[PDB]
Amino acid sequence: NPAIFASGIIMDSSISKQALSEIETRHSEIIKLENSIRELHD
């Protein structure tokens, strides 16, 4: 009598190139400060 099965759906988390893209884009400015500090120390 006891006989059952099932099928489950999968998830892709939440990376929709808006939070990923915003972090990636914002990380551009830091290079300017790196260059400025290097110039100052030279």
Binding site: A19, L20, E22, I23, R26
Partner: peptide
């Protein structure tokens, strides 16, 4: 001064950044 980095992901890697920057 109230914050330096927004948390794209809730991971430890972000936290120290703020302090580091500070």
């Amino acid at each position: 001064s109230g914050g330096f980095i927004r948390r794209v992901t809730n991971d430890a890697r972000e936290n120290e950044m703020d302090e580091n920057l500070e």
